[PDB]
């Protein structure tokens, strides 16, 4: 298959954010789309190789809970195109507008997010930048997992980084478990309506402490009706040492099981 999208086809619109390799806009191409895109046609083989790699990953993802890849432009500017999510990111809902989701919808947002990752990890893909920001909500109902900028087979966003990633020896601290840890921090975002470590106000300290294992999210901050199995599961994903964290299959199952025992 060739998903290259010929020149002239796209009508690019309003700015949205600065994604890993460039700038996102709303655009049009057989309907509303998103277009992540590098503004310069000065594209060094560092930029032009990242792009080639993101596309290579996006083109292996066909799942309800992964953001639908649709195609790529080379000319005029480098561009990647995806489905447009009516509803914005999970970050926006939880922290910007403070949407008070029902506890069942929370558990489902978790369920679904886990499903996407599980699918991703079976396809042998490490997302490497999971976070509410990159989790998008479709008609406020369905979860779509986003920015594949960093992502691979075989960045000033710290709060979702496992300690070994904050630490650094290997060029390869990333694993399915380092993804599990970021997922851990999403469960917390969802169960607390809050980013972790708000008592601390100094970012560099957060970095140092997490990596050492002095800081770790305050689970007492969960909502009352948060099930104690969900409370116990956050703990599994947030376990300081990578080897004690469960992979997504067992996480799904646990969220599934706990969804069943539910008022
Ligand atoms: C305070 O109120 C603000 C109003 N919200 C505006 C709004 C609404 C919806 C979106 N939706 C949307 N929907 C999907 C999006 C996908 C990517 C994205 C990022 C990286 N790679 C591919 C796509 C990036 C941004 C995306 N944004 C954005 C802003």
From Swiss-Prot:
<comment type="similarity">
    <text>Belongs to the protein kinase superfamily. TKL Ser/Thr protein kinase family. RAF subfamily.</text>
</comment>
<feature type="binding site">
    <location>
        <position position="36"/>
    </location>
    <ligand>
        <name>ATP</name>
    </ligand>
</feature>
<feature type="active site" description="Proton acceptor">
    <location>
        <position position="129"/>
    </location>
</feature>
<protein>
    <recommendedName>
        <fullName>Serine/threonine-protein kinase B-raf</fullName>
    </recommendedName>
</protein>
<feature type="binding site">
    <location>
        <begin position="16"/>
        <end position="24"/>
    </location>
    <ligand>
        <name>ATP</name>
    </ligand>
</feature>
<feature type="modified residue" description="Omega-N-methylarginine; by PRMT5">
    <location>
        <position position="212"/>
    </location>
</feature>
<feature type="cross-link" description="Glycyl lysine isopeptide (Lys-Gly) (interchain with G-Cter in ubiquitin)">
    <location>
        <position position="131"/>
    </location>
</feature>
<feature type="domain" description="Protein kinase">
    <location>
        <begin position="10"/>
        <end position="258"/>
    </location>
</feature>
<comment type="subunit">
    <text>Monomer. Homodimer. Heterodimerizes with RAF1, and the heterodimer possesses a highly increased kinase activity compared to the respective homodimers or monomers. Heterodimerization is mitogen-regulated and enhanced by 14-3-3 proteins. Heterodimerizes (via N-terminus) with KSR1 (via N-terminus) or KSR2 (via N-terminus) in a MAP2K1-dependent manner. Interacts with MAP2K1 and MAP2K2. Found in a complex with at least BRAF, HRAS, MAP2K1, MAPK3 and RGS14.</text>
</comment>
<comment type="function">
    <text>Protein kinase involved in the transduction of mitogenic signals from the cell membrane to the nucleus. Phosphorylates MAP2K1, and thereby activates the MAP kinase signal transduction pathway. Phosphorylates PFKFB2. May play a role in the postsynaptic responses of hippocampal neurons.</text>
</comment>
């Amino acid at each position: 298959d060739d998903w290259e999208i010929p020149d002239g086809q796209i009508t690019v619109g309003q700015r949205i954010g600065s994604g890993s390799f460039g700038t996102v806009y709303k655009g049009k191409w057989h309907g509303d789309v998103a277009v992540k895109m590098l503004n310069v046609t000065a594209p060094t083989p560092q930029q032009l190789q990242a792009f080639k790699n993101e596309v290579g990953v996006l083109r292996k993802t066909r799942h309800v809970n992964i953001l639908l890849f649709m195609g790529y432009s080379t000319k005029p500017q480098l561009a990647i195109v995806t489905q447009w999510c009516e509803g914005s990111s999970l970050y926006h809902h939880l922290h910007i507008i403070e949407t008070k989701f029902e506890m069942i919808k929370l558990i489902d947002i978790a369920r679904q997010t886990a499903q996407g990752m599980d699918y991703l990890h079976a396809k042998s893909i490490i997302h490497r930048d999971l976070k509410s920001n990159n989790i998008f909500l479709h008609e406020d109902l369905t979860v779509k997992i986003g920015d594949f900028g960093l992502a691979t087979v075989k960045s000033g966003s710290i709060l979702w980084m496992a300690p070994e990633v904050i630490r650094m020896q290997d060029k390869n601290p990333y694993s399915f478990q380092s993804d599990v840890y970021a997922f851990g921090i999403v469960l917390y975002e969802l169960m607390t309506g809050q980013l972790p470590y708000s008592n601390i106000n100094n970012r560099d300290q957060i970095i140092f402490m997490v990596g050492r294992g002095y800081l770790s999210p305050d689970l007492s901050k969960v909502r009352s009706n948060c099930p104690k199995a969900m409370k116990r599961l956050m703990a599994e994903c947030l376990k300081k040492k990578r080897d004690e964290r469960p992979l997504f299959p067992q996480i799904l199952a646990s969220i599934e099981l706990l969804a069943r025992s539910l008022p």
